[PDB]
């Protein structure tokens, strides 16, 4: 006894759907200055 195996449900869409939320780098600032949690794996209060 064996399972049926179906082919995958292919899901067509336009390329633009994936390009959404992509902003030009001339409108993205270095927001990393506000990144807090990223410093826990990097530095220490005494090291700071």
């Amino acid at each position: 006894g064996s399972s049926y195996v179906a082919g995958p449900l292919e899901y067509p869409s336009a390329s633009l759907i994936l390009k959404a939320l992509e902003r030009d780098f001339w409108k993205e600032a270095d927001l990393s200055m506000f990144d807090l949690i990223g410093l826990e794996n990097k530095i220490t209060r005494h090291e700071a």
């Binding site: 064996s2 049926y4 195996v5 179906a6 449900l9």
Partner: protein
Amino acid sequence: TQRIASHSHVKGLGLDESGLAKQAASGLVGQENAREACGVIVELIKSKKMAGRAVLLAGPPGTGKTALALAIAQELGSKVPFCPMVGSEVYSTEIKKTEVLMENFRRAIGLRIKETKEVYEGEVTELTPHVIIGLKTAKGTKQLKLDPSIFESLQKERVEAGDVIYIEANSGAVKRQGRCDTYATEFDLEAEEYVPLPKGDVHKKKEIIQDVTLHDLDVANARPQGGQDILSMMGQLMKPKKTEITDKLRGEINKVVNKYIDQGIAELVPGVLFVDEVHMLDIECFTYLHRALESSIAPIVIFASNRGNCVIRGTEDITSPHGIPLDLLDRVMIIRTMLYTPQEMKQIIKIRAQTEGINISEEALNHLGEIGTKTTLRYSVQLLTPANLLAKINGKDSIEKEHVEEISELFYDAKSSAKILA
């Protein structure tokens, strides 16, 4: 022998060729009008033309509603899907009520898909890293090039040269099942198990017929287990849980199944959804059932209810003739089950005794029927096996009147207990 349940004696509806109900046939006794209506319902299900037609078996407790539903299931056969469910099963903690109803609706549509299964089997000779592996069988030896996924599966099975392996190329699944019986004598003692070499060709194609519901396809495509790739594998680590399958997925599955039917590689078998106690649904469920039953994909749905004019669940003070809102009673055909005469009760008790392997004398049977004219039919039936046990303990191979009387003195019915409490 298989264990005996409450409805084991029911083998069908007991209709003649013209569809009139015989008085006592196939387990059922009496209830001719309801049996003939269930006959028409069986023909409706067999016709496979109508979608979403609903029928309600409504009648007092003990009047055979569930027996009639199971008799319909028997008359249909095992080929036709039959999904028994209870309205109280809709209160999932995982998915919404409407999703549970929809999943039961999709369970009741069956699909026989003919699928060509191709298998590579043999004893491995070479495992050169894409991989050019070799397989040898009772006929001969072939060299094959396979996807690296199959090689990773072989490594998962830890296949070494000289082992007998089974490769289903359709699903990318490899089963290493033993080392070849040729090696079974080389060492006086080893931890492995030996199996003979395969007798057929290395690459074999076999055509099989698979029985699945539409619900199986829906859940398989919603939670894929066949990706065999890094992301799908990482997803498979997650705890399983029912999910609210979308209408887009079900539409895609409908299109795929229509393509299968058009190609001739599949046949669709509309079956039955049976909701045994529908009054435990709430007003949200009934409102959803309006839209669901109007669907063109829906199965034939059977309802049973024993409530009088009672309050609809999920409402405050709305009463309806069976606990089902008037809007849903308009969409169903109603079959009424009537109370039994003493003679019909005695016939049912005799059938139950013969199904339970119990011998009972005429005087004991008459006393049991008299007890069943009081109390209920089910109470009187349930006294058969205690009384036969006490007969066996007293060294008798048949229930006598004294054994029935003593069991009725040991075990009380609902009415007697209520009288004692009151």
